[PDB]
Symmetry: C2
Subunit: 148 residues, 2 copies
């Protein structure tokens, strides 16, 4: 395991709970976070999934966006707001599939992180649902950021 | 559990960076602290700054480690301290904090070093012994280029 090596699945609430204005803030924050991360083929790989009624893969770990900071940071700004129900558990299962079956070759020693991004209001599903515990059992690290 | 992490923030305060860029780092760190699920049962944080010498701001035993508002306000006040770049001793300090100085019993929880620099000087974070030792303890070392 090297310095600056992480596979991160960002799981971004785009649901009716959140509201466009808060969702725009999230995208702003995520853009800034991606700009400061050391993103690259041998360093941080990023995937981005938004969730509401269904899950919407933006890109997985095999995407060119996953290893190019300018591609990823530009792309996150234009993710559309979806406004439906809040299917956290399926969101988490989509990250779990990307992290544990979809990483790039040579990353077995690389930590697997879910970074949730929400309100802060009703994101208890992250601490609670079976899909979160499974990722942790696989050795994944699940954290939720509340951009408010 | 979800949200359970020990983070040692290691902030470059060297002359290399400048007071302008130092205040920017402090502002990015304030926001980053505000969004993190900091609490006694969740994310615990410690902050150390470094130039020629390492300046402990707080360890994981401090009330600032478990209180989002405490930590965020304290980071803003942190003094610029022009100097050289003692990354090795910075990382030794984070190592001591993370692996001997957690609250009970967070001995099992993920341990992270998050460095904040001016986008440059991230080579030492890869190569020095202190970094390697962290990684071999299972600690995760990631440098943010706030710049």
């Amino acid at each position: 395991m090297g310095t600056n090596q992480l596979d991160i699945c960002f799981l971004i609430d785009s649901s009716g709970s959140i509201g466009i204005q808060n969702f725009r803030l999230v995208k702003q924050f995520l853009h800034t976070f991606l700009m400061v991360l050391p993103i690259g083929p041998e360093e941080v790989n990023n995937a981005v999934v938004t969730y509401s009624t269904d899950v919407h893969l933006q890109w997985d770990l095999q995407s060119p966006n996953a290893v190019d900071k300018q591609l990823a940071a530009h792309a996150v700004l234009d993710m559309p707001y979806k406004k439906g129900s809040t299917n956290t558990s399926d969101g988490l299962k989509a990250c779990k599939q990307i992290l544990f079956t979809g990483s790039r070759p040579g990353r077995e020693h690389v930590p697997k992180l879910v970074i949730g991004m929400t309100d802060g209001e009703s994101d208890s599903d992250f601490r609670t649902v079976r899909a979160a515990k499974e990722i942790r059992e696989l050795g994944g690290i699940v954290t939720v950021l509340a951009v408010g």
